[PDB]
Each structure stands twice: as C-alpha cells, then as structure tokens.
Ligand binder design. Structure first.
Ligand code: HEM
Ligand SMILES: [Mg+2]
Ligand SMILES: [Mg+2]
Ligand SMILES: [Mg+2]
Ligand SMILES: [Mg+2]
Length: 370
C-alpha cells in the first residue's frame, strides 16, 4: 500500500519516511553545525537529561516565562503552577464548546462538493482552547484567528499580538479571578513574582504551541485515512478507533519532526563524543520509525499498541496540551466522518505541506465528496 509520503512527496530529505535507515543513530553534520539524533533510545536519553541537554537555546549564541526555553529549577516551578489548566478535567469542561464549534464549522461546508479541509475545519479550530485558557474575551478571539493565520502563511502580525497580550496581562491584574491568568499574577518563580513580560512570553508560547501542530494533526490523519481505505472503513464503522488512529498519525507523520537541545558539558551518546556548547537536534519523526521500538515501523497501523511515539515528546517538557490535542483531534474527525459519508483527495488539486524542515504536516488539503 502506497504511503502518503510516496503519494505526494512529503519531505524527501526525511529519509525515515521512505523506510531508509540512518547510518548511525547519532550523527554530526558540518553543514548544519549540529548533532542529529535519529534513534528512539538515544532520543529518550537526551530528553531524559535536561541538565546536560539544555532547552535554553540562547546558550549557543525575552525567553523568561517560556517553558520551552526554560530549564529546571525555574521550569519545575512554572510547569507545576500551570499544570492544573491542562488536566483531563479541563479537557472535559471544554469539550462541549469545541464540539459546538466543530458542528458550526462543518455546517458551512455540509452542502459543498469540494472544500479545503484546512481552511474549513483545521485552521479555525485550535485558537478557541488556548483563548479559553488565557481568558481572552470572546470578542477579541477573531484577532487571534487572523494573527495565527498570518504567521502560518509566512514579524508584523506577531508585533500586534504581543502588543495585545501586554495590555491583556495588565488588565488581568485589575480583574482578579481564579483562572490561569490569575494564578500567573499571584505566581512565584525563583522566590519572585512574575512580571508582565513573563506572562506575555508564556501566553505567546501557549498560542504558538497549541495552534499549528494541532492543525497538522487533523490534516495528517485525514491524509492517512485517504491512503489506507480498509483501515478508514473500520474507523467509520467503529469510532472508538479514532484515539488510536490519531496516535499512529503522530507516529507516522510527527507534526514536530524535531526539537532542539544544547549541550552543557562533554557527553557521550551511543559511542559518539559530543562537545560542550553544541546544538543537538532530536528527531521525533526519525525516532518514531525506529524498528528497535516499533514492529514494522514503515507500516501505518491504527491498532497500536500501546503506541509510545514521541509526537508529544518525552521528559520534563512533555506536551502539556497532550490531553487537549487528542480531544480536539477526536472531535474534529468524528464529526467530519458524520457529516461526509465519502471523502477523497483530488489529483488535480494536490495537498500541500509546511516548508519547515523540522516539521511534517499538511498545509492545505482539498477534498471532494464524489
Ligand atoms: C498535535 C499537536 C501538537 C504537537 C505536534 C505538539 C508538540 C509538542 C512537543 C513535541 C512538546 C515537547 C517539546 C520539547 O520537549 O521540547 C510540546 C510541549 C508544549 N506544548 Fe504541545 N503539541 C501539540 C499540541 C499542543 C496543544 C493543544 C497545546 C496547548 C494549547 C500545546 C502547547 C505546548 C506548550 C506551551 C509546551 C511547552 C511545555 C514545556 O516546555 O514544559 N501543544 N508540544
Ligand atoms: Mg534566552
Ligand atoms: Mg536576549
Ligand atoms: Mg488499509
Ligand atoms: Mg480525549
């Protein structure tokens, strides 16, 4: 069966998408001036040692409040403080709103013969969750819909969004409430109250981290359903397969193909000697194709497994929006299949993908009913 990668030429440089093995699981590149980690076990080792493999990228050369760029102990405190807003409890509380939105979005395309799934369902979806968590007024949510689209399209839309979030942080200081913003106002990291800049960077981080990759998740999954008809038929007849389907979609096409790490000391990984102050690229996409961990990794199999892929990552930085992303993917797919009995890709209007080399996901997906 022809994979999505072979059908449309998804990231030809991503050799693992075409069943090709890396010569070594840890390889240095002179052109990139960075170490590449391709193996599953080696990835877990790198991700499991944040003291050696820092997340603070500025070391190799503003980021305060941004969890992605923060190491322990500051990371430990800041994550612990915001953890409550990402639990399965918050997932269940937000589901009816996202369900309603999914219905509304699919009402618009219900009678269409052709439609782009990305612009119809995938793009106008993920903002709502983050907007709810950041207590963005419902009237200002359209602004974030526009801003996030522009940044995806390509500095100017980012400037306006940061400008809004600065005043939003100052407004929430005048309005005390038991939400995520309110807890950030009363928060203490390193024995110090977080300034507006800390909260702005956190808000910016959350918006970026909760948008494009969720969009890629929706796109990639439908792309996989179109490539595997026998498996897609089982999904329509058994909707309880959807959670497993989404997990495999992330293994097969990891929206975040790689994350970045920086060495703090001389370290040996898989016999390779890494020097201090060097960039390390941890390829989630490559690690998800490791046959030492996954049986027949070249095959798409929704029935895995359990499926311990690295699409959400691994370690202390493990995706906080993990539970929220799976839910958003589930609701989007379930209702999409309910509304459209038949969905097909168009050879005349082929799907396009994000150019980013550290990503693997759909940018546009034209669909037809017959
Ligand atoms: C399917 C879509 C998604 C993908 C591909 C994805 C990818 C990731 C990955 C791989 C990490 C770990 C990063 C690392 O180790 O360096 C992560 C953490 C994070 N994610 Fe998820 N994610 C997704 C959904 C979300 C959602 C729904 C949110 C929230 C709205 C979110 C916001 C974050 C934030 C703020 C972090 C940083 C947490 C930390 O550093 O402790 N991402 N995202
Ligand atoms: Mg910095
Ligand atoms: Mg700086
Ligand atoms: Mg099949
Ligand atoms: Mg769920």
């Amino acid at each position: 069966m022809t994979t999505p990668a072979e059908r449309w030429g998804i990231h030809p440089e991503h050799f693992w998408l075409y069943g090709r093995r890396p010569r070594q699981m840890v390889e240095f590149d002179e052109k990139m001036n960075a170490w590449n980690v391709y193996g599953y076990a080696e990835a877990i080792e790198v991700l499991g040692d944040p003291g050696t493999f820092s997340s603070h990228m500025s070391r190799l050369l503003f980021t305060e409040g941004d969890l992605l760029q923060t190491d322990p102990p500051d990371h430990r405190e800041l994550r612990k403080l915001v953890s409550h807003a990402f639990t399965p409890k918050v997932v269940a509380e937000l589901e009816p709103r996202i369900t309603a939105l999914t219905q509304e979005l699919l009402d618009a395309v219900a009678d269409r013969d052709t439609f782009d799934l990305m612009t119809a369902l995938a793009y106008p979806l993920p903002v709502t969750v983050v907007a709810e968590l950041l207590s963005i007024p419902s009237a200002d949510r359209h602004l974030f819909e526009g801003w996030m689209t522009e940044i995806v399209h390509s500095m100017a839309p980012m400037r306006k969004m940061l400008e809004y979030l600065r005043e939003h942080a100052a407004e929430c200081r005048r309005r005390p409430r038991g939400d995520l913003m309110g807890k950030l106002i009363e928060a203490e990291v390193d024995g110090r109250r977080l300034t507006d800049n800390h909260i702005v960077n956190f808000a910016k981080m959350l918006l970026i981290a909760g948008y494009l990759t969720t969009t890629m998740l929706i796109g990639n999954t439908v792309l996989c359903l179109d490539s595997y008809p026998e498996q897609a038929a089982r999904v329509r007849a058994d909707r309880s397969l959807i959670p497993g389907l989404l997990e495999e979609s992330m293994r097969f096409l990891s929206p975040v193909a790689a994350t970045y790490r920086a060495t703090t000391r001389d370290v040996e990984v898989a016999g390779q000697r890494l020097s201090a102050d060097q960039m390390v690229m941890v390829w989630f996409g490559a690690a998800n194709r490791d046959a030492r961990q996954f049986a027949e990794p070249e095959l798409f199999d929704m029935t895995r497994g359990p499926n311990p892929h690295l699409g959400f990552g691994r370690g202390i930085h493990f995706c906080l929006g993990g539970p929220l992303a799976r839910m958003e993917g589930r609701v989007a797919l379930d209702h999409l299949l309910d509304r459209f009995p038949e969905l097909y890709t168009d050879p005349e209007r082929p799907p396009t993908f994000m150019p980013g080399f550290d990503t693997t996901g759909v940018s546009s997906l034209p669909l037809r009913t017959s």
